């Protein structure tokens, strides 16, 4: 399958040094234009405008982050700086191990994410929508650091 199982992990340390964790599961689909590989890392939420070399002097994240990007309604960004896959490629250049797109406000992006390339990304690009997107963004919009685990299967 092209199904991606995504686990989102919230964690707190204790004085003993042992962690308490809380996991939320959800499902998306791997883009055919990205790798069909598993990935894992700290979530970094980015506004889709942040993947433009606009303005900027933008943030350096430690290598290995999982980008979570909620697409805008296309009416709000009619002049996109890069294609949606281009923005994923840009994240990978900036150290992302994977990108998860919430495409619920731009479901037509799935057409581009389902279309193959002879220059595919070497890292996975997952899209979520529906209840799965709602589950993801509810956790990401909490104050807390979270880790994502993306599993092929």
Residue numbers in the entry: 56 to 208
From the paper:
Zinc RING finger 3 (ZNRF3) and its homolog RING finger 43 (RNF43) are trans-membrane E3 ubiquitin ligases that negatively regulate Wnt signaling. ZNRF3 and RNF43 contain an extracellular N-terminal protease-associated (PA) domain, a single pass trans-membrane helix and an intracellular C-terminal RING domain with E3 ligase activity. Interaction of ZNRF3 or RNF43 with complexes of frizzled receptors (FZD) and low-density lipoprotein receptor-related protein (LRP) 5/6 leads to Frizzled ubiquitination and endocytosis of the heterodimeric receptors, thereby reducing the capacity of Wnt-driven signal transduction. RNF43 and its homolog ZNRF3 have been identified as E3 ligases that ubiquitinate Frizzled receptors for degradation, whereas RSPO1 captures ZNRF3 for removal from membrane, thereby increasing Frizzled expression on the cell surface.
Purified protein was crystallized and crystals exhibited space group P21 with cell dimensions a = 35.7 Å, b = 73.5 Å and c = 58.6 Å and β = 97.5°, contained two molecules per asymmetric unit and diffracted to 1.5 Å resolution. The central core of the molecule is formed by a parallel β-sheet, consisting of strands β3-β4-β5-β6 surrounded by three α-helices and two short 310-helices. In ZNRF3, strands β1 and β2 form an extended β-hairpin ‘flap’, while RNF43 is three residues shorter and displays a flexible loop in this region. In the crystal structure of ZNRF3, we observe two molecules in the asymmetric unit. However, at present it is not clear if such arrangement is physiologically relevant.
